[PDB]
């Protein structure tokens, strides 16, 4: 009949899914190790392409099946279109099945090679010995740290990105005269990624005993005992463990190092931060070479003892600055430049293709070094790490945005008690721990705020993702390479663009297999009105639309045909309402709009999007009515909703909060007077009482945009506030400091932020106690002039800042006695505040000089040169 | 309808491209190493031929699809011709697909052999020791360069084309009395293309210590330390690193050579110019034997201590001048001539087929030596190097013309920020760095202007391209061989001609 | 290391013990009856099926995979429980590797399973919100 077609193509769908299970298992097995056989790599590419096309067809089938339920809404016209679409996906599934059958029939040999898989020398690294550049201060610091410490065995770890020069520094320390005199016994051990403990112990024994054939039947435990005897009979010993990769390796090798109270030391180099953290609470992070040091190293490597020719100085320096201070990159470039003609033209050519040289000329040198860390990544983390290469090199990627993108792209599959955001944060922490991602900024609470990949790893990610994995492709112009044609655009899965977006869209590209458009450019671009429908028309299967840097003036109807869309980022200066047709995108997870208008109206039923997770805006959003007809009488709950960033005060009813039991972050902007005003009924509990019903709420932000505060406001009692609230932000709300005491009764409060005169009043004295877990306090642009506290008022305060608060007179001296205080910021303050800060510093110096343990307190005043 | 045929043949085109991806991967894997099995080589030739025909058919299909847009310009007459052409390429694609299917069905065994590929002794080279010809001045120059220098470890590299005689000069220096007196310690190390650092260090230790079984559990780092101790306890030391192939080998081996301010020296022979440039800013380029020296070497190799017969002097000299001063070519010719009858007729016959002798009589001697450098070429550079054999031997090929030809023939595939000309120039620089191509003239700005291949490598390129790869074929007359017929001309992909073009 | 040394017929019996909530005390009589009902105990000798299941439980206890919390005055096992960490291992093996049984719960973002995966569930373990 009419509906027989859906079942007929579904019959093929289960068989396609059965084949996909085998192909995904084949892909995972092939990805377990790096295949060098060309036929195997070609087969893997073919399997991955047919798999990705299969997911695209299955996703289209799922959308068609979901939309089939709306036949009654449009009658015959929709029936005809649905029949044509169902036939279209039917022949797409058939074509995929033919390709799968062809792969099974013809490519059986590679399938055998992976399934059975019937099919090395340990290469100790060689490093610079004499001309080590820029490591004088680092070596001196580590040597001084080796000398001083406890009498037990202590480990000094050196951590960093691959190729940073950890082994070069370790060998420089190993040959340093001061430790050649201090440490009578010096042992170098190469603890490779793979190693044998028996071989390690016999190697250590060989340093002392020439005859080692008598240990043929000696167990490894007795070998460790013999190593302990050999090392302990002398004085101090320094042992260098090179390239330790796992915690188990250190735990299993350290049994051979005796404890004698002789201040024995172990210097360990590692790429893993967690291993370093376990072995020492303060791992030594190896520094990057400065631009001058990078040029000096390149000059020494290329021209030996001689200076650079004057004509090659400027191009060479430009090359060194493009190496980003990584000694391995500088060495590779020097090897490439030595084979050149020592002319300005060729050096400039190298400067324009630094990455290509660093990767493709000699993959045996550096590409293998990076692959050592990359191949140890878990299979689910490889895609996440390669995603980081989409953003331009050197750009700072927000952790929140990267986490949301990972969740939207489906990389994060998880079913336990933790949220998807927590799992993605754990993935980011794992990447950072392996030193594959560098954290550039952290929040005051310890979270990662922005992170970036080093330029050389970014080049490696671009290489792997574009030429090997076909994960994403980049579009650009300027040189002979133009915008891609339809033939290769038909095979592109994700599209990264940075500039000339309207020019690219004017060509009406084909994006039938494109599932991600990432506008990674920083410049805000006003899209022409005639080019607005270009994005949905070009890419019907768009799953991720990161158009945050693109300003849209209107919503075209084709935007509502993106039923696979999960991530939205849009900027706008004209949009005031969200059309109801936007609710047809039932797969939306993250909805971000950045509108300059005062108010925004959510006419679309976001409650229908059961998979919705974030609604992040900057203007006051009016949520749609929760009243639903009898056709949808069931009490659907948006349990996956985590963020309601800028909802209206009048929409803060108990109705919306019932539908959002797991809301973590909440924010309100507008007439907050309506939030605090009691209802006309007898009970005085207003709409703010509904906020306290959110058990999982942790973040609250209130923005009072109106200045008609003729009636003073009162904070509700503390028990009305959420019990598990951990962070509160207030700005331009015009409260009074007498209400701070209410906030002091919050048991779980940790971070409090007041901006643009959140509280009003000159002075206010708090009693002892309160704020049990508060750690971060931020004040900016306030009228406060006096503030009295006590030592017990802030037991756990760590951060304290006043910005442009010249009206403040002094601070309590009890703050100087706070054990957990680490940093205070004073900006554009009066000279009296500066003198009080100097007195606090002098008191801290005297207390440290009294003989007790150093507190480690630090104080900063900016600008430093003011008051001179 | 009328346009249904284009889509129908395009449906076969995607399947043909899918098969071509597998076949190209198979060809790349087979080209990774030199197969000796005859069935495997025949299958590789069959796959390559069917691949090349497939590209020809696909190119014709692309041209037909592009020209289909001009139907309105010539109406029915062009429509009829386009239909006939579309049918013609349709049956060509069908025939290619049948051949691909036949290869898959019948030749599965060789495909297994390449895909799984389940299936040596280091041969230290032997060189002339007593009758070294023409290297007196070169040896004296290198010896004087070894004596003078800084107090640190300095490397004197000897570079040249394969078979030039770098090891012969190195051994002559190694046995020279002046350095046997100047350098108390002399060590010869054969750093082959493949080597083990532990074996190298143990070999060096064996020069000084007879008992080496106590280093069973000693790490390679401590072995290098022991080598440093053994070498440093004496005076100056000279160490000969023979046939160093890569920069990593020198970086990884030099850790065992101590610095004492005693003017220690390392004499290294290499075929790579970049390795020599890194180890010393002024590498010593080994000279070619002159025509008189080539004849003298040939006379010594063939007639031992005796002079050549007067009747064989003129033919022999003509042979030596055809060896182009390469000692390896002279040695191979001498081996071939010793088995001859020492008559003018046979020597003249050898003079007319010098290249054939230098390649085919004893492939075990020289063809393997050239294949050592050739097989290390990247897969995309092998076709570019073999192209250089199209031009006549001894001719000077302009670099600009060669670069343009490489780009036109589609050898240069590149997508980065550099231009195609820059990539082709980098390919030419890589070929020159491996001493497979000799630069004869450079522009004042440093660019390569004209380059030529040595005659013996040119013969090797002709051998590989005509009989193994079928890259190009040469057309000539004058001897019993006439212009090719239709049967073999139907299989020729590129045509090189030099004379009698109108005929 | 201990799990792989289990006999093939004891692996299913041990993984069954993970169905009950962690830290709960499982009656030996109830566990034996459940094992017999689920067909794990196949036996044809002179002993009863209850005796064979009791022997299986004794074997599990002997390997210290199951802890006996109470014994009858006659020496029989009355209640036994698995340590929480082995219970987590049993949950891991049974849900993600063997598909022996699946657990249904709510409270966090994970809701009741849909028809697609419920169609593949062989055994259903539930603890709360049964009427819902
Ligand atoms: N300060 C330096 N001056 C000159 N060259 C350096 C310096 N630091 C490192 N290098 C060079 O950089 C390359 C890599 O450095 P190194 O061997 O120390 O790596 P690493 O940080 O230990 O990395 P891995 O984790 O891969 O072992 C080597 O070729 C080394 O010579
Ligand atoms: N001056 C010479 N007089 C006589 N024979 C020579 C001379 N130079 C080289 N030969 C001969 O040429 C052949 C190759 O020379 P040689 O072994 O020195 O090669 P090479 O330049 O070191 O090359 P490779 O890079 O292949 O090791 C040998 O058989 C050697 O005897």
Numbering used by the authors:
A (entry chain D): 19 to 137, 143 to 891
B (entry chain G): 19 to 137, 143 to 526
C (entry chain B): 395 to 526
Give passages from the manuscript.
We purified SlNRC3 activated by PVX-CP and sensor Rx in the presence and absence of AVRcap1b following transient expression in *N. benthamiana* and used cryo-EM to determine the structure of both complexes to understand how the effector could be interfering with immune activation. As in previous work, we used mutants in the MADA motif of the N-terminal α1 helices—which assemble into a funnel-like membrane pore in the resistosome—because they abolish cell death induction without compromising receptor activation or oligomerization. Upon effector or PAMP recognition by intracellular sensors or cell- surface receptors, respectively, resting-state NRC3 dissociates into monomers and assembles into resistosomes in a stepwise manner. The fully assembled complex inserts into the plasma membrane to trigger localized cell death and limit pathogen spread. Previous studies have established that paired NLRs like NLRC4 and NRG1 oligomerize through interactions with heterodimeric (NLRC4-NAIP2) or heterotrimeric (NRG1-EDS1-SAG101) complexes. In contrast, oligomerization of NRC helpers doesn’t involve additional partner proteins. The helper NLRs dissociate to assemble the resistosome independently, with no evidence of sensor-mediated nucleation.
